[PDB]
Amino acid sequence: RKTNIEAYRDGLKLKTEEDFFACDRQYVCQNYAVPVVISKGKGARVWDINGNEYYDFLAGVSSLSQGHCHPRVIAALCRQAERLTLTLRAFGNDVTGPACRFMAEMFGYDRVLLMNTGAEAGESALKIARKWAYEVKEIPPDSAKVILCNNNYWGRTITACSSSTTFDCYNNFGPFTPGFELIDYDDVGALEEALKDPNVAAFFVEPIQGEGGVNVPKPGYLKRAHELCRSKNVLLIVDEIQTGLCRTGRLLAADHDEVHPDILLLGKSLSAGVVPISAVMGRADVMDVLKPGTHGSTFGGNPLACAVAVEALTVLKDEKLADRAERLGAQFRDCLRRELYGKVPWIKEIRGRGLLNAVEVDSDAIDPNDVVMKLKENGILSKPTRGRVMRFIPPLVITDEEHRDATTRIIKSFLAVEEER
């Protein structure tokens, strides 16, 4: 049977890509800028409405680490969706509990708060950190500070905008939530100075800055940061929404440093890009400050998303996608480096861990969008961040044959752009 969206879509006679673009310009709020109309995905590949194939090298900015339409994940969705999707957490069910137990054991935490979005996991963590700082550190009323890094990105709520240094994220959205102190990323000295304020509740940080440009910090940064935080009884909140779940070659990007975050945020690939589910995890004596009535969410921890998440997380384990991301990521960086550094003098850096990789180009000596369009032409879909940072974030299930082909196609697109300069 045709579903309603199918029969409605057919009724509008949307034939070409252009017809869809015009539909979007008319009815969809215009808060995004590429031209392709994707119809179907499977694994690392997607297909547009004309049956043209591409490798998806954005993968939801790491929401589709398991690939598009993973059969196991789709089957767990569909089987749960037939039984039960929503109870509210005002009633028990036979899924939410076991899911939290499953996550708590896999990542080694006492308590799991399930929310829907990455941003909500962020607000949730800032809230828990404030309340814990008022009730356990006994810092004076309303004086709680949270430290974070210039060019952070954890969401789009007004509080998120309030803690951003990125003009377009905050401009004309105030007045702002106070209580933030901004420091440079990857700067051990600045963290230490800012840690002198005894009203600090938390340092909030990404192991690698994602939307900020795949800024990989210097060896030992997170380890040292954790030590300085403990020293002043300050929570380390580590956002692994983009970096977690095998993307960087380990279960969490913090494992590279053997850091166990005091509070852990997961999202995106936690559902294999099927439904929004995020999580905040922490020890009991921190997480337990959230008493009944003091925080909540309608869809948070619904049994449908739980079942998906358990299956999604099991795919990461069973298919060994961590090891895979490490092997392929090193091969990817090695290949691009041999073939492009020196030969392509407008490539400033090729950087990454695992399959969270990027090519920083000099935007005074090329137009970034030419690279993006030549990528598209050669079967590679990608979106840069901050104009000049090309990102390469394929699903981790991309096969060896596929990953070799894509790497070739990528190298070719950069060389072809250089040639054409």
60 to 79, contacts with a second copy by CB under 8 A? 60-61, 63-64, 68-69, 72, 74-79
How many residues bind a second copy (CB under 8 A)? The answer is 140
Find out whether 119 is annotated in a ligand binding site.
yes
Q: Does 206 bind ligand PLP (CB under 6 A)?
A: yes
Regarding 357 and contact with a second copy (CB under 8 A), the answer is no
Site membership for a second copy, residue 340 (CB under 8 A): no
Q: Which is nearer to ligand PLP, 206 or 311 (CB)?
A: 206
Q: Which amino acid is at 181?
A: E
Residue 239 interacts with ligand PLP (CB under 6 A): yes or no = yes
Residue 238: CB partners within 8 Å, gap ≥ 6?
205, 206, 207, 222, 252, 254, 259, 261, 263, 264, 265
List the one residue out of 298, 304, 274, 315 whose CA is nearest residue 115.
298
146 neighbors 183 (Cβ within 8 angstroms): no
Which token pair is 367? 């137009």
For ligand PLP, which stretch binds (CB under 6 A), given 4-12, 66-74, 238-246, 335-343? Answer: 238-246
Both tokens of 224, joined, read 């040292």
Residue with tokens 């739980």: 306
- Establish whether 92 is an annotated binding residue: no
Owner of token pair 């913090």? 254
Residue 381 makes contact with a second copy by CB under 8 A: yes
Residue from 137, 150, 162, 319 in contact with a second copy (CB under 8 A) = 162
Q: Which of residues 244-303 bind a second copy (CB under 8 A)?
A: 267-268, 273-276, 280, 287-299, 301-302
How far lies 418's CA from each of 292, 346, 347, 358, 366, in Å?
60, 8, 10, 18, 9
Residue 242 is assigned to a ligand binding site: yes
The residue range among 125-133, 218-226, 296-304, 374-382 that interacts with ligand PLP, by the rule CB under 6 A, is 296-304
Q: State yes or no: residue 123 binds ligand PLP (CB under 6 A).
A: no
Asked if residue 119 binds a second copy (CB under 8 A), the reply is: yes
Q: Which of residues 9 and 404 has its CB atom nearest to a second copy in the complex?
A: 9
**Which member of 41, 43, 67, 118 binds ligand PLP (CB under 6 A)?**
118
Q: Flag whether 249 is marked binding.
A: no
Q: Contact 376/57 with Cβ under 8 angstroms?
A: no
Long-range CB pairs of 254-258, under 8 A, 24+ apart, other chains included: 254/207, 254/222, 256/207, 256/222, 256/353, 257/207, 257/220, 257/221, 257/222, 257/223, 257/226, 258/223
Binding status of residue 104 toward a second copy by CB under 8 A: yes
Residues at the binding site for pyridoxal 5'-phosphate are 118-119, 242, 298
Residues that bind ligand PLP (CB under 6 A): 61, 117-119, 122, 153-155, 206, 210-211, 239, 241-242, 267, 297-299
